[PDB]
Structures are given as structure tokens and as C-alpha cells.
Scaffold this active site. Structure first.
Site, PDB file in Angstrom:
ATOM      1  N   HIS A 122       0.828  -1.207   0.000  1.00 27.24           N
ATOM      2  CA  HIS A 122       0.000   0.000   0.000  1.00 27.24           C
ATOM      3  C   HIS A 122       0.866   1.261   0.000  1.00 27.24           C
ATOM      4  O   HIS A 122       0.610   2.211  -0.755  1.00 27.24           O
ATOM      5  CB  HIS A 122      -0.931  -0.001   1.212  1.00 27.24           C
ATOM      6  CG  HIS A 122      -1.832  -1.198   1.309  1.00 27.24           C
ATOM      7  ND1 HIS A 122      -2.641  -1.419   2.406  1.00 27.24           N
ATOM      8  CD2 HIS A 122      -2.071  -2.221   0.449  1.00 27.24           C
ATOM      9  CE1 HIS A 122      -3.313  -2.546   2.231  1.00 27.24           C
ATOM     10  NE2 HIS A 122      -2.992  -3.049   1.047  1.00 27.24           N
ATOM     11  N   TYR A 126       1.195   4.367  -3.016  1.00 24.58           N
ATOM     12  CA  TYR A 126       1.100   5.843  -2.915  1.00 24.58           C
ATOM     13  C   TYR A 126       2.343   6.456  -3.613  1.00 24.58           C
ATOM     14  O   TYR A 126       2.193   7.466  -4.367  1.00 24.58           O
ATOM     15  CB  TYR A 126       1.038   6.377  -1.458  1.00 24.58           C
ATOM     16  CG  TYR A 126      -0.296   6.058  -0.891  1.00 24.58           C
ATOM     17  CD1 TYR A 126      -1.446   6.684  -1.405  1.00 24.58           C
ATOM     18  CD2 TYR A 126      -0.403   5.172   0.187  1.00 24.58           C
ATOM     19  CE1 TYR A 126      -2.695   6.406  -0.874  1.00 24.58           C
ATOM     20  CE2 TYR A 126      -1.664   4.907   0.707  1.00 24.58           C
ATOM     21  CZ  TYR A 126      -2.790   5.507   0.184  1.00 24.58           C
ATOM     22  OH  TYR A 126      -3.981   5.204   0.733  1.00 24.58           O
TER      23      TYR A 126
END
Lengths: 307, 307
Positions: A122, A126
């Protein structure tokens, strides 16, 4: 009189237990042919079949959309997402790995290593979004803002001491608060943008992150309930008191941060209600009743849909 | 006089460092747009693109081959693989996760969470092989044998105390000894069988496990060398002495175990040479010279090929 099936399991310990006991016992291998809690196998199968990487999503298709946003809104997105990447970093390197020695079963021990790795993915995703959309100056100024914004830092500093595992149940609650609660004030923003037709491909990454973090929260709540149900009635009372005290403190910190983040854009009031709604769901996931009113948890239908 | 690029990095700490320092500092998010050591990005890309699960391999195609083996050899395979699953379990739940706080870079911290998860997948894959080929009695008797065989247990018990991280360099060496050395005495057996046309689909899983464990060993050696090169000459001497002392002790334990495991089948002498050959490669991976003779490390060409 007679030996039972799998008696060896009762005469041995897992490696982490061998270490916890001060290096005594005979160590057993994990046995994936005899699963003690069927839920562990179900979760293992789901999280591994859900593997994904951000390079598969065409974020560059969002460039036209991104270029219609004002510099002020591009800055808001970069700051918000970099703050979420900080939470990812804490989960991957401290919070989720601290749950391995807190496990009830051998299979649970390795499920939490999957959790830690996937929230590292995750954080990577980003980064992948920033690589495609942002200038180098936007990226650097967001990292500077993250370290220097006290309302942001205080939320992280409130939770990290519990991961030392002085108390395994307090550690597990502090771990679940990251994907189960602190996530949602930041995810309000991509849900808001998506509902208005902006950054559709970025939103696909947001939904893949959500799919993982929801399971992380659910599984921690499941293991919390199985352990708490074995405690005395007064120890269960003490744990419920701790959970509510910690959550209320964290809501105060989160409200201060979301006001600083969103007030100039007019998003603060809605994002706080969205956050407290999910605090109510967090309590239910631990087997408790939500005390929050309908008014303080009201969500726009278009945000509920994006969710 | 002038601010440097990414000055924020020098004014902040990673979350694990914040905890190690006793809860002081401003915490930074990982920055995947500024990678401090390019090798970290290279390894991240390789290990994530190499993701696999055992359900994709048709192990059931091995049933005809398995049924031509005597019960004694089926027992040997089940025992050997269950002993390897114990090593996997130690790496996934203790050894690899202990390297997260020992890291030189933010990106390295999460690479070790990938390592821990993938060696959990390795343990799962041995379970998958047993599910397809073995009877329930074969599986249970192998787990009983693992806990009750002292030569097997002593190898694991020698390494686990270093993962407490009293010394980060000793921890890292003890971690790398699992995929870099103890693996190979067990992998001799599938390489031997594959060279004789038995269990070809099981061998495909063995090769996928090998592909991962080789990178795990290499990366730990790379980080070991980068840190050791910064120590004083006398501290480098002390570390080299520790590595050789620990390896020699582990070779003695491994020789005793491989003799107990293989002697009745005539495989012990060849498997020990195969093991010591890889102990030589292990030392080179840490930047040291191998002291072993050509005679004690001789490998059959057909095994070298399977490798």
C-alpha cells in the site's frame, strides 16, 4: 488409556513460544494439514488470492484529470496521501509484525506476516501515484509537512507504545485502530474526488487498498473476541474500559488533524462525521456497542456508495 | 548556507527508530520516490514479481511416481520435508521479522516483511504436497518424529537466541544461515529423486522455493557487508571469528542430523558434501574466503545440474 490423534501438538511449542518461554520445549513445525481454527485457513486463502501490485493500474490515464485541479488541491492530495503512507509504514514495520507473538494458533502467526507485507505494498502504491502525477517539489514539500505537522504526528505517537506487547490485547487493539479507524479520515478525500469524476484510476488503487485493510481490521477483531471471551468478567470490564478510553482520545486527536488538513477546503465537517461513523464500526468489530449518535455519524449517500 | 534537497530526512526518524530511541523524534513516511540505496529497489522489484502460490503446480500428476516408491522412501521424504517446514516456520515467525529493526534503510525494513511472508508460503507448499501424496498417518508420524529427534532440534536451538537482537550483525548472520546453509542438506533429496525421474512436479515447487531463498541469502549478505565495512579493523576481526565459529558448530550439528536421516538409504556421505559445498558459498556471500577442500565439497554433476 489410548493416545489421541495429533498428541505431538500437546507435547511441543511453536518457535516463537519456545523463545517466549526462555528457550525451553520441543519445537513443532506448522501443520497445514491440521488447521486448528478453520477461520485461519479461510483468511489465508482470501488474502493470498487478493495479491496485487500498483504497476498493473494505469495511473497515467489520470494525468488529464490531475491537470484540471488547482495547485492548492494538488497540494492537499499529496499531503493527505503522504500522511496515509506514514500510517502504512507504522503498520508494516511495527504494528502488524508485533502481532506475530500474540497469536492463538500457528497459522495466525504467518497471516500477520502477510498483513505487514501487503500494507508495505500500500505504501509503495502511494509512491507510484506520486511518481506519475506529482513534481519533485510537491513530493518533497509533502514529506516536510508530514514531519512538521504536530496534529498529524500526535496520532501516531499515541499508538506506538502499545506495540511493545507489555499487554497483548492492548497491542492488538492499537494495531487494529490503524486500518480500522485512522484510515478513514484520509480516504474521505479520494471518495469525494471520485464522486465528482476526478482521478478514476487512482480511485481503483484506493479500492484495492481498502479491500485489504478491511480484512486486516476484521481478523484482528475476530482474534480479540476469541481471547477476551476467556477472561474473567472483571478483566473483560477492564479491557472494554481501555478500548473506549483509547478510542475517545484518538478521536480527539483525529478531529484536530482533520480540521487543520481540510478546513480551508470546506471538507472538515463531512470528513469528521465519516471518521466517527467508522469508529462506530470499529467498536462493533470488537464485539461492543457503538455510542455515537446518528447525527455525528451521518454520511452523504454518494460517499457511502464510493465506500 | 543553503538548504539541501530532502533535508527533512536528516531531521526525522523511521517509526522503528522512534521506538528504539525510546519514543523521541519526528517520524517520517517511507519515500519510494527517493530510494537511498538503488539495490533496495532492485530487490523489491524482483521479489514481488516472483510471487507464486503452490496451488498453481499440478502435484497430483506425481501420484503415479509416488506410488512406485517403497513405504520406507515415502517415509524419508515426508520426514525430510517436515524438517524443512520447521526451518521455514522459524524464518517466517522469528528470524526474518527480527531483521526489520536491524535495517540500514527504510526500504530494507519492508523487504524483510516480504521475506517472512514468502517463507510462510514455502511452509504452506510443503503442506500442499503432503495433502496430495501422503496418508494422514504418514503426516502425523513425521510431525512426531520432528519433535522427538534431538539431532534435528539442536540445529534450530543453536540459532534462535541470536534473533533477540542483542547484536544486530550476529542476528543477521544467524538469519542467513537458515536459507543459505541449513536448506541444502534437505534439498539434496529432491535433487537426487528428480535426477532419477521421480516426482517431477514436486521438484518444480522445490525450484520456486530455491529461487526465493537464494535472494534472501544474497540480500542479507549484501547488508552484512555494507555494515561491517564501517566497523573498526578489530571489530571486523571479531565478527569474522564469530562467523567461522558459529558455522563450524552448525556443520557439526548438521552432519550428525544428516547421518541419522540418510545413513540407512546410503545418501549420507553425498548429502554432507553437498551441504559443506554450500557452507563455502555462504562464507563468500558474507565477503569471506572458503576454507573447505575440494574433496569435502565434491558434488555429483547430476546434482549440480538439478541445482
Amino acid at each position: 488409556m489410548a493416545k489421541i490423534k495429533n498428541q505431538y501438538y500437546n507435547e511441543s511449542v511453536s518457535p516463537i513460544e519456545y523463545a517466549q518461554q526462555g528457550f525451553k520445549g520441543k519445537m513443532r513445525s506448522v501443520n497445514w494439514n491440521v488447521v486448528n481454527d478453520e477461520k485461519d485457513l479461510e483468511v489465508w486463502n482470501r488474502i493470498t488470492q487478493n495479491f496485487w501490485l500498483p504497476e498493473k493500474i494505469p495511473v497515467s490515464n489520470d494525468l488529464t484529470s490531475w491537470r484540471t485541479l488547482t495547485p492548492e488541491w494538488q497540494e492537499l492530495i499529496t499531503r493527505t496521501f503522504t500522511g496515509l503512507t506514514l500510517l502504512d509504514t507504522i503498520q508494516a514495520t511495527v504494528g502488524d509484525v508485533a502481532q506475530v507473538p500474540n497469536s492463538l494458533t500457528d497459522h495466525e502467526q504467518v497471516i500477520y506476516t502477510n498483513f505487514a507485507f501487503m500494507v508495505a505494498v500500500h505504501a509503495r502504491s502511494y509512491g507510484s501515484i506520486f511518481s506519475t502525477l506529482c513534481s519533485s517539489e510537491q513530493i518533497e514539500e509533502a514529506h516536510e509537512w508530514v514531519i512538521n505537522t504536530e496534529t498529524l504526528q500526535e496520532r501516531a505517537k499515541a499508538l506506538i507504545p502499545y506495540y511493545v506487547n507489555d499487554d497483548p490485547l492492548k497491542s492488538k487493539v492499537a494495531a487494529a485502530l490503524m486500518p480500522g479507524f485512522l484510515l478513514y479520515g484520509g480516504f474521505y478525500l479520494p471518495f469525494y474526488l471520485s464522486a465528482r469524476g476526478k482521478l478514476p484510476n487512482t480511485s481503483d488503487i484506493i479500492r484495492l487498498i481498502l479491500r485489504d485493510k478491511v480484512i486486516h481490521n476484521y481478523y484482528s477483531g475476530y482474534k480479540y473476541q476469541k481471547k477476551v471471551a476467556k477472561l474473567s468478567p472483571e478483566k473483560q470490564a477492564e479491557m472494554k474500559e481501555f478500548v473506549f478510553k483509547l478510542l475517545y482520545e484518538l478521536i480527539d486527536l483525529e478531529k484536530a488533524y482533520l480540521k487543520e488538513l481540510y478546513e480551508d477546503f470546506g471538507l472538515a465537517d463531512d470528513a469528521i462525521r465519516f471518521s466517527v461513523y467508522n469508529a462506530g464500526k470499529f467498536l462493533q468489530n470488537l464485539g461492543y456497542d457503538s455510542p455515537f449518535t446518528e447525527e455525528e455519524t451521518r454520511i452523504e449517500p454518494e460517499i457511502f456508495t464510493q465506500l
